[PDB]
Design a protein around this ligand. Structure first.
Ligand SMILES: Cc1cccc2c1CCN(C(=O)[C@@H]1CCCC[C@@H]1C(=O)O)[C@@H]2CN1Cc2ccccc2C1=O
Ligand SMILES: Cc1cccc2c1CCN(C(=O)[C@@H]1CCCC[C@@H]1C(=O)O)[C@@H]2CN1Cc2ccccc2C1=O
Ligand SMILES: Cc1cccc2c1CCN(C(=O)[C@@H]1CCCC[C@@H]1C(=O)O)[C@@H]2CN1Cc2ccccc2C1=O
Lengths: 285, 287, 286
């Protein structure tokens, strides 16, 4: 119903937790984070907003986060949960059967191919076999109960490659690579298709968008975004993809574009309270 | 067929060496050198003639990317110039379908080509076909089932594990399953119905790992790795065995020549070149 | 008022500084550049001529320039200023509120979309919002206190596109693309319209000229130049466009054509002392 936006970066790492209502286009100002982070990811399981990974880029120094904080909408309080095995900045996340998968990310110079799964019942993190490629700024999506790691950065090369995880087999397999090289792109699922919007190809921030159809196994371009952006928040709400903020190789966007798959067009539906990049977003339900 | 050729290469400067290895007796033939020394060129045999395509002449006095096509006749021991390509293509990939030589990718100065063009020996003419989905230099090319596969490479910024397939009749490219490892300047060939990708450079380390693509299952599978790490390696197949020649291992220029037996799944150093080099154009006499 | 021409190329990068007086048709031989340069841009601020960016082709080495040099007409002397953040060969520049905007250009294989502003009173460069497209061989024009970047080459494609900068907002927005693809075209402003003369479309050097009406948002061809040319110097003096030199594929032009917008006709008013391409041109203001 509503769309969260947690953390981000603008001159320093942010603690902003806000919520956008697309029903009437209003910004709800909620409780600020325990610790300011950028590069963190957001997901919602059991009506609880989880803030996974990230990095506190402050004037005093930099610290990559292994912290999992939780926010119940009613109680309006951040409650620290069990931390991950390793810090994960520039993290991507997905969920299968109410279990939060923490994919890739970075801890300083360490670029992760490792993946670990959180159980909200037990408050425990367990590792679930590494990816074929090390991926930071990775985009994660789940379709037909299979988790996809899309694009990212392996420490040297930006990636167009994607790979599919199978929970029942506990196994990774490489799929068809994207047309465009994308690190820090917005990845989500809409109408049985894996969308990949924006990102960074190694030299330019992108506004191009493409989607993977599971039946054909083919990546196809769609209408591009208005503004170029990497490190953008992304989510789906009532059959429409929303993208929030990001970095354009200079400044930090407050723009919020909305994709309509029927007409194949984007439109700037709103603006955030302030410009920021590296936010983590998730729809309420 | 008979002779495994090695053309050009690099050691301190671009080389013009044409040498032929007879794998039956293990002898080396010192043939007529190239008119222009090059590295990053590709080799292929059409009819009964060896073709040297593209590359770069890296000399102390300057660098020049080559658009040249030269044809060697074994009977006369002479190089004859052919019609040049539309653009220079250093670190080029080449494959042969229906007696036509396909020039794939490569670089010209700052330009990294996704373009592809086809040579007709009958007419001595180059013609551009549909370009690749990705710009690739140091790309591996493999011909299988009358389709042209472009594997790995470097787009100017990023090294690639990605691979795509061309359909000559439809004149279009389609993206296939990416490799397990990122490979720039790898040795790519075809051994009974499987596209191999040996060695290469992942952006940090020089690779000795080898993986092969099964067209029907659409999956890459690792096989026995090479003894020595190498990128920019020449490659060919002779009597059901892959031969890899020379390359760059991060500091030295290899003279080593390893041979893969697919039955035993093992590599073995069958011979060594007269001098160590990288970026050679390699081909073999046909069946 | 004098039409300056600095640097250029003929067999190698040139260091010439000459000034054309359009009233009597005389050429002045001024103090040469301290370093020879081609692909540079000229502009005048506060009665001082500035030479920005470019490349010195010896050869070799071939050095792309990040240098800013200030020519003082009262002393006939060049003085070095603070250098740009990066080298910019085939640069475009424009002036807004006494500040020099360095737009695009190349440093080797790097094709810049970055833009930086110079403050003469401080002798400092500062990075502003980068362009939406990377552009080398780009033409720059200033109209209604907005900076327009037109044409060029992004590293892959030769551009017919153009974009407008908004100093107060600090952002770029894409405008209507040109009718013709142009890199190394002469871009200037005359009677509230952006002109784009000559250049290279990927196949041929152009003599066609088109102008952009900002309100209608449409490009319209005008009378073409007599001679085809790319990498041409351009300026506007007293209601008339002047194009200087250039490259046509074979020769290096010494021709100087003059456009009269009332009659819509070009005419060769003078020659340069020697044929050249990639010159930086500017005029004494007012
Ligand atoms: C999730 C993600 C994927 C890919 C890139 C980034 C992010 C998060 C934000 N981020 C970051 O680099 C994080 C914010 C800026 C401080 C460093 C921090 C990081 O991840 O190291 C970059 C984007 N960039 C690059 C950059 C360069 C200079 C200034 C700002 C930015 C920016 O936002
Ligand atoms: C076909 C191909 C694919 C991938 C890489 C290379 C080649 C050809 C040779 N090549 C090259 O870079 C060519 C040889 C060395 C001069 C440059 C030349 C080139 O293509 O620019 C590099 C390999 N490397 C990298 C390197 C660095 C330092 C010294 C040697 C080498 C080397 O062999
Ligand atoms: C400002 C500008 C915009 C667009 C193209 C060029 C310039 C400056 C001169 N320039 C250049 O290429 C510069 C002069 C020639 C040496 C290279 C130099 C450069 O910037 O690369 C080219 C045009 N060319 C191409 C060419 C090829 C051969 C000989 C001369 C020319 C020429 O004038």
């Amino acid at each position: 119903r509503l769309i969260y936006t947690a953390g981000g970066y603008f001159r320093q790492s942010l603690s902003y937790l806000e919520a956008y209502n697309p029903s009437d286009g209003t910004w709800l100002d909620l409780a600020d984070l325990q610790v300011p982070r950028s590069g963190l990811a957001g997901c919602v399981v059991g009506g609880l907003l989880y803030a996974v990974g990230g990095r506190n880029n402050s004037p005093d120094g930099n610290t990559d986060s292994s912290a999992l904080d939780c926010y119940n909408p009613m109680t309006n309080q951040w409650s620290p949960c069990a931390p991950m095995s390793v810090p994960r900045n520039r993290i991507g996340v997905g969920v299968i059967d109410g279990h939060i998968y923490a994919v890739g990310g970075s801890h300083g110079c360490i670029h992760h191919n490792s993946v670990e799964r959180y159980e909200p019942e037990r408050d425990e993190w367990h590792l679930v076999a590494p990816m074929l490629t090390r991926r930071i700024g990775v985009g994660v999506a789940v379709l037909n109960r299979l988790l996809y790691a899309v694009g990212g950065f392996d420490g040297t090369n930006r990636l167009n490659s994607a790979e599919c995880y199978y929970p029942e087999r506990n196994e990774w397999r490489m799929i068809t690579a994207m047309n465009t090289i994308r690190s820090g792109a917005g990845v989500c699922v809409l109408h049985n298709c894996i969308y990949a919007a924006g990102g960074y190809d190694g030299q330019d921030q992108l506004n191009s968008v493409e989607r993977y159809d599971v039946e054909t196994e083919t990546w196809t371009f769609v209408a591009p975004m208005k503004h170029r952006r990497s490190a953008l928040g992304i989510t789906v709400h009532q059959g429409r993809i929303y993208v929030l903020g990001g970095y354009d190789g200079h400044t930090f966007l407050d723009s919020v574009e909305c994709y309509d798959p029927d007409t194949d067009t984007w439109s700037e539906v709103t603006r955030m309270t302030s410009g920021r990049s590296g936010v983590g977003v998730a729809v309420t339900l």
